[PDB]
Amino acid sequence: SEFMIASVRGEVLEVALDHVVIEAAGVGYRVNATPATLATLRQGTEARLITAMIVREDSMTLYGFPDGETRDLFLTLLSVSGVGPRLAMAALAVHDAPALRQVLADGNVAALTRVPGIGKRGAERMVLELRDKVVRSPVVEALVGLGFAAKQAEEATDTVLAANHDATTSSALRSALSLLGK
Amino acid sequence: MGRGSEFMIASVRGEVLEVALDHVVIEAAGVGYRVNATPATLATLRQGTEARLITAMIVREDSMTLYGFPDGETRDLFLTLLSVSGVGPRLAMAALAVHDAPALRQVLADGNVAALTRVPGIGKRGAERMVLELRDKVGAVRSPVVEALVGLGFAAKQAEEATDTVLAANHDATTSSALRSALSLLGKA
Amino acid sequence: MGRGSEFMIASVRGEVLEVALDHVVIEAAGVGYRVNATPATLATLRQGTEARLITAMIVREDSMTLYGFPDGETRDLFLTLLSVSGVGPRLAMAALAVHDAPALRQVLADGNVAALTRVPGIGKRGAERMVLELRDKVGAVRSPVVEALVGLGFAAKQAEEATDTVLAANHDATTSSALRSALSLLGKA
Amino acid sequence: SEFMIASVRGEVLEVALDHVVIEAAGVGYRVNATPATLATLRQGTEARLITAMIVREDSMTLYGFPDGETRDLFLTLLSVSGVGPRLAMAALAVHDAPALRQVLADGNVAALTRVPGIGKRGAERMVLELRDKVVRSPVVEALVGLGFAAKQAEEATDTVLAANHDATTSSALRSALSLLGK
Amino acid sequence: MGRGSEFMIASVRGEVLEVALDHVVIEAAGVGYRVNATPATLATLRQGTEARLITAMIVREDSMTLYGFPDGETRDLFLTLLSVSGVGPRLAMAALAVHDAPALRQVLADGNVAALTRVPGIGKRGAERMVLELRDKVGAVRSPVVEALVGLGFAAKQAEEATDTVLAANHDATTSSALRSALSLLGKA
Amino acid sequence: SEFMIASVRGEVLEVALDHVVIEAAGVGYRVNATPATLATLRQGTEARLITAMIVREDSMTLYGFPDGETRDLFLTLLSVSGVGPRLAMAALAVHDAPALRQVLADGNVAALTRVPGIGKRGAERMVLELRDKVVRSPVVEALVGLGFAAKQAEEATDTVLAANHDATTSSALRSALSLLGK
Amino acid sequence: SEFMIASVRGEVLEVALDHVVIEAAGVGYRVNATPATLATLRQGTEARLITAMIVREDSMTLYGFPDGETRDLFLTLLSVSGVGPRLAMAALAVHDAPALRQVLADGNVAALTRVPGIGKRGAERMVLELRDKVVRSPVVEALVGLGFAAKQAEEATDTVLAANHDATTSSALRSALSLLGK
Amino acid sequence: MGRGSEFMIASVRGEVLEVALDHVVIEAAGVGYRVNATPATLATLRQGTEARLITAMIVREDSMTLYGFPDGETRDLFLTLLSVSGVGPRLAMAALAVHDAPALRQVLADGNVAALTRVPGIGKRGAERMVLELRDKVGAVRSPVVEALVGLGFAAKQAEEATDTVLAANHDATTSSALRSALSLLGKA
């Protein structure tokens, strides 16, 4: 969820079948990508991918995608116990984000099992863990994320919105926070 | 930096590509850096415009993260929070999202545990450990120099002496010169 | 890349600031990257001029290192060496400093253990493990596609079938299209 | 000895007493430096420091210096058991590279002990470990570094130099290597 | 043991030196072993008398702990709980302190999430992951043998065949003999 | 709090100043102990110490004491950030458990600071963290320890005790648990 | 090669299909064993197995065998990259030590591949690594093991044996060592 | 023990089950302990008889090992060797197999680098680091007490004073009593 490299943009130096090399500031970044994302990319031209940076004791890796929503879905898959980055990429290479989303949403285990490395029991854990996972609400969420409880988060938010109808998401949040700081 | 060491990425500047509620993406040299930030810092930021945030880089076996702030003082305060046992980066960000640096500073300074407990994840006993550990920690020529010496390992006593001698002999002395003169003497030459 | 995974820095390009005998410093965006390289690769490099090396990034708990080479094939060969148990980055660099990629390739291919043993740190039993592990490993439309599928986890049998079907239906097929068509079928849709 | 970031160049954004911030490509790099190196630096101007990058499980740090020789001396200090980066920086902040070099060379333990954190027994281990440590030879060394033994390294080198008097360090090394590949 | 591997200390027997509410100390060979146990298991234990508990040994970088139970089945159930992601030893002990093995078994078997949620630290979504992962997991001659084969790596298909052949030829067969005969055949001899 | 070796009993083979060797079943266990605990021990005779077993990646160590209460106080000291086993032993070697207890209880920082390695700010963190730390209640605690909340723990307990006055600590706990299993 | 628990002896409390529990001094040790070794064991009776102790960050495990030679072969299998304890046990459960030995010795890859988890390329690495691996010599070896080189080891040994014909393995080694200490 | 800390298994006693050339197996309480030992220590050992070795227990992430010796002094010397950077357990055993403790002691004491270099794995520069680090380290009532105090963290100055005062007042003083009296005073009571 929190990493450092959120995207890479610059000249495509190489399109392979499971990754691309994008040169930013003379540095050529290898970012792994599905064949679908890769097909939109042309060597010699400038591109931008939205990335998830993965840091392990013995590796550092970029996984890239067309948009933040797809990148966030990738991270979401990684939140399932037993689902690592390769598998998550595998899954998205077989089912594009929309299709992967609906499969999970509809609990389509047969679809899921079509992915190498996802057995039936694995498919089910995924569906179970992810089924539900695929102004006012965003704000409540931010508060919750900061540690606040749904109850109190909602109340500060409703009060803030009530007093100020022009409120944007950020202002609402800063007003709510200010009240919660009590 | 502050009571939380030395890191590599001290700031990121360039085009704001995205303002979310708990982070921004700032593009430097085609690289889009995610830096986590309070809603207060975030509000000054506009997508499509250039921005600069002063950052703390956090390195763990399984992650690397930037936390960003309007100024070095606020960034140093964040690092300072992390020096308390049981206070990690999320919580420290949490604390600063609820109380802006000035307010957080005074709370700690005044030992306002009630204020502190208003932060999700900070209980009363946690609040107190914080106040205790940080009360004196929140906040000239002669003093900065002594501190640099102390930081290098020198003892207050000897550090102050080298510094007073140096400043006595040279009244024009700047902080760096004073420090280099003091060091020279302490090297016993 | 090769039998040694996926990393982040695939190349570095910019001004050569220093050519030493076992590495060069290439400045990209004001950042001077040390990349280790064979004397052979180094000789093509001139300080003061712009260069580009294709790199393997190595990440360990206590280090981060770039190894650089003239082309992707040579870089992939390096990674391949690292896939042998007991062969680390220094040794692999050592091996390529003594035998250039082509020669190293043929040595392994021909199982030339005497050639191999000429490398400091490669004994006879080490040489043999290498030849054994790498003999078939050194080195189209249909085959690259099958391989990508296999890499994604698919079995040779099914991978070849999807691929032949795809190529049969579409003779204009490129490697990527073939792969996307094959994948689509394998998704069973 | 082998790390990734060998220098940082760009605009000085801040000079402190124990570090500087140098902005390269919009990225502000904190590099720790002695008060001596720091004094040559002016905020608002472009600078370049030669750096040692230090990577630990829980940190990544740049230590900067005016030249490669000084940076290499820093790394050399770290090769002594018990001498970490802070201490090494401490040592160089008290004795500039030349002076530190001579102290070690002359085994001046009293000088050495003037450094906070270096006791007499520590001073001695240092002197002992480092006393000796502060065309034809460079080449032999490269070969040795690659794993070759002094004996054979010297022989390939002498033979190469003998046959080609115009030989540069790199050519000699590539010729020697070629012979050694036998 | 169960879905939680292989360990070294499978039981401890000797004099009860102390019965507390969440552990007992049992002295074997002058060594006093602390073994953590449910209040239910603890109640059968009397200081000054000899006892034997069947244990799971837990080894972590910074700890070594014994958890003890009246029988192997209960101990195996504990290990099984630990196979669920997010369920550690304290929680598993917690769960068994609230629902005795039989009751815990049935709860999981019947997917009784309400029962499960009665356990501190088990939320509804946690309860469900448990039920899902463990529903089939709670609970002959031919079957134990097949399982041992499977455990050794053999596939159900081939494991069953070797086993049926073995049992057909030898009706007197015990579980071990069957397994050794089956193995012998599978070695293809 | 939970470790494996809770005591060692058998023949004293050696009494040193900072540890003893106690032989159980032909195995000679080194257990570190304060000079006070050590003085009660005689080589050639049988002894029993109550121990805390400490397991780290690169060591395994027994610390022994006359009784469980003293052993538990040792573990309690280790719960303070910055206080490791040596220091904790140091502290108890300077102030016996009772005295150490009261010092902490009375916030006697001067007393505390008399311990090598405990500065004033360290002394205070200790006092702060430990000041409060030195049938019905034990039961509530067990329940709380199992994860139950004070409120509900107390209620199950009071109800159990009310219905059964003969109740022992264990029975009360098993009855309470049974109700809480609902 | 060097571990702590070299055998366990005492009452068999349980014989399963993939392990036994042997109670020594009131402690019940689980030792994993092949079905062949297990068949010689009877619950209620005393037994002794020769064991390899395996220590990992997150586990400690005993693997037992009838004799030291079989236990040493197990450790030998573990010296192959890619062959862990389960697999090694698997291998010995399919081919008894003698048969496993000869298979490796004869490079019988087909035999080897009959083991679940051993593919052809795995089988070959094994054969390659292990083919050769299955008074005077033992002594030379001990010396070599201590770090001495074959040449010098043999010479000290021959000289020692020459002077003393009655020499046992240990005496020869102690005499040789004494000479080598020069 | 010595300059190598505190461990758990300080000795093993019981029946010798096997004498090999670089280790013995000693059975205590049905448990057969492998303890590694020099050929010199091994020679005093007879299979079938009871023996006792004084041991250093070595704990690493991936191993646990006993090294054994005739007496505590020799065991402490071994631990002392391990305090030298670059000297691990095998090498230390190696060193003691070539030079018995007394001889190893004197070699170090006399700085006999030639003797030292006779050990496989000890080069000249290694020999010297050893001599340097250990020269003073090889080897009363008042002194042992001061040392215990120092070990507890007290400074030589204050440690000696408490000790001299204690011994002055009580001439009958034993090492332990002296230490407990000294400690009592230092507690400032």
Quaternary structure type: homooctamer
H/E element order of chain A? EEEHEEHHHHHHHH
Per CATH, the architecture of the largest domain in chain A is Beta Barrel
Output the strand order for the largest sheet of chain A.
1-2-3-5-4
Q: Evaluate the radius of gyration of chain A.
A: 20 Å
Summarize the amount of helix of chain A as a percent range. Answer: 40-55%
Percent of residues in beta strands of chain A? 15-25%
Identify the CATH homologous superfamily of the largest domain in chain A.
Answer: Nucleic acid-binding proteins
Largest interface: A-C, 36 and 41 residues
Overall outline of chain A: globular
Which CATH class of the largest domain in chain A is shown?
Mainly Beta
Q: Please, how many helices of chain A?
A: 9
* Class inferred from helices and paired strands of chain A: alpha+beta
Number of strands of chain A: 5
The description of the largest β-sheet of chain A is: 5 strands, mixed, barrel
Number of domains of chain A: 3
Calculate the terminal CA-CA distance of chain A, rounded to whole Å: 29 Å
For this structure, the CATH topology of the largest domain in chain A is OB fold (Dihydrolipoamide Acetyltransferase, E2P)
Keywords (chains B, C, E, H): Cytoplasm, DNA damage, DNA recombination, DNA repair, DNA-binding
Protein name (chains B, C, E, H): Holliday junction branch migration complex subunit RuvA
Family (chains B, C, E, H): Belongs to the RuvA family.
GO molecular function, one term (chains B, C, E, H): ATP binding
